[PDB]
Design a protein around this ligand. Sequence first.
Ligand SMILES: COc1cc(CNC(=O)C2CC3(C2)CN([C@H](C)c2cccc4ccccc24)C3)ccn1
Ligand SMILES: COc1cc(CNC(=O)C2CC3(C2)CN([C@H](C)c2cccc4ccccc24)C3)ccn1
Ligand SMILES: [Zn+2]
Ligand SMILES: [Zn+2]
Ligand SMILES: [Zn+2]
Ligand SMILES: [Zn+2]
Lengths: 314, 314
Amino acid sequence: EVKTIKVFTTVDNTNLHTQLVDMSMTYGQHFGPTYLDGADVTKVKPHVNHEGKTFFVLPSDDTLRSEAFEYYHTLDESFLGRYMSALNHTKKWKFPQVGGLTSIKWADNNCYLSSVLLALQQIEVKFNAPALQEAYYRARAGDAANFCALILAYSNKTVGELGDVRETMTHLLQHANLESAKRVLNLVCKHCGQKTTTLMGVEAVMYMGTLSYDELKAGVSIPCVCGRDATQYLVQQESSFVMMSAPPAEYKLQQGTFLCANEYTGNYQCGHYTHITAKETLYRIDGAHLTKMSEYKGPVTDVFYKETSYTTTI
Amino acid sequence: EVKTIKVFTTVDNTNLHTQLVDMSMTYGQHFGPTYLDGADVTKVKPHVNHEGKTFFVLPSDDTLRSEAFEYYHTLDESFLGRYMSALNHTKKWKFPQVGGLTSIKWADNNCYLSSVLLALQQIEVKFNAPALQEAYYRARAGDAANFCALILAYSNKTVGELGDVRETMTHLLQHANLESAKRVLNLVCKHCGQKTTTLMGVEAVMYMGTLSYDELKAGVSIPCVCGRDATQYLVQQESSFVMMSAPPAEYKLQQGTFLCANEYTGNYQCGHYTHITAKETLYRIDGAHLTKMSEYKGPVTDVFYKETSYTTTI
Ligand SMILES: COc1cc(CNC(=O)C2CC3(C2)CN([C@H](C)c2cccc4ccccc24)C3)ccn1
Ligand SMILES: COc1cc(CNC(=O)C2CC3(C2)CN([C@H](C)c2cccc4ccccc24)C3)ccn1
Ligand SMILES: [Zn+2]
Ligand SMILES: [Zn+2]
Ligand SMILES: [Zn+2]
Ligand SMILES: [Zn+2]
């Protein structure tokens, strides 16, 4: 016998069709290219959680590859379908202005997207893709619906599933214009010797291992390629911002030492991001809710700092 | 005494504030730059219809003029506020796929916007403004929410008020890339003589006075600048399409003679637009509703034709 599921298919997000789909075949073998909640489910077999959900059917068109590359800088023929189906969810989200910044109301595990949006409103940055920059322009004014849908598409993430704000910044900053961002590190191994690495681009602004920007300037531990544990320190930095990242741990945020930060309470499976910014005192933006603080001591994961140009003291 | 109205103000379209505003002053003198339903009401005094409506407050920012010019090709400092407040209405509209084309469900007098959207999906055209072209790209796939909000902003029109599809095409095609569109007319006055006018750009594709494209090729009446009634006929046309327009009157649409058309039933104050296209037979798209026809005889207002290059016979 055949075990089926009841689902709905649509091509306009208005008129639906009842479908009893066979779990023996993929959605692509049923309907063609199919998307659900911002994810491509073309080569995906039906699963019991899909019952009652509506599926977006968008047939492929080779003539649109040139256009999609112009606006979004992508060659993925599924980007359009995932962007539209994710936007069908984000346009219903609420974007309240908290602490003079655009935040996002709690919905579909967007508490990590809220932290990404709040940090981007405080660092000087521009994106190369025209559609991503126009959406970023409207998001800074309050209309962040298209912007979050783009961030979801660029990260190959699904509406509802949790994500890391650090991982998402990696995927997003590849389309930023960090061409003139430069970072010079001096790795000091006690077997191999001293070593200059000139990192540029997305790598010149992001570090993983520590939250303190002064810790990187003075010296932070790191395993050398020979196996031994070495030490590297920042020699020259040249960008508009830096983003320090580290796994969750109790970090103490002082006033005037940083630009903004993100914290994460919970295990690896489930947790809640909240955003901290420095204005006249420390603000904590938990979605649509705001708290005020002289200082914050919690599980910080990412910290942002302002920069123009730095050089170590000889 | 002072006569007031009860209204709501917001800066996020989520959190509202009750306001009792004085009709003696404008909304700008109350709150700053203020928008309502896609219209700038900054220098507008409160009126009894505004009771219960929510107003969008967006303060001015001179640093955004350069950005807004890049994405939208506009120097109007109110374009952003009118675009966002109009988009807050169009995202709730329904865009059903009728006859293989993206139409719009009846709402807020959008029956003229539906006719504009349906014609743009059948003529070969591209827009210069990047944000307008990306929205046009998504509208051709089904997501026309941002596109209609842009058309409303470019036309300085308000959500809910009726409009002409011909007038709206004029405002919209100024941002199209019709740089290589050329039209040559020969005006023949029986007092002044024969006269060549080389029309280019938005004027090379649009004519007002007749619906028949063969009537313009053969000869159509027109008052000369001397007062007498002359006659002009098309000598050379060089574009991807032409749009013939005329006030409402019974026109008989045959199969295979045109690309698509718009009709309008009613007086000058109120009326309903419906769209006719030619596929295997004549389709009539009245919003979310479709009728099929061997031919249509009704009050046609605008007709579109396909073109590549034309030259009159010597
Ligand atoms: C079998 O289904 C799953 C489901 C999940 C869902 N979870 C995620 O998507 C993760 C995205 C994070 C949760 C990882 N981020 C925090 C800040 C984090 C980073 C690095 C190390 C950590 C160590 C301990 C706790 C948190 C850490 C947010 C994951 C895996 N399998
Ligand atoms: C005092 O408030 C008003 C309200 C309106 C509302 N109406 C409009 O916005 C017009 C946009 C049209 C209605 C004009 N279009 C039709 C096709 C049309 C064009 C040219 C000539 C016509 C002659 C007779 C009937 C229709 C004609 C659509 C107007 C004025 N004052
Ligand atoms: Zn959440
Ligand atoms: Zn070593
Ligand atoms: Zn209507
Ligand atoms: Zn004359």
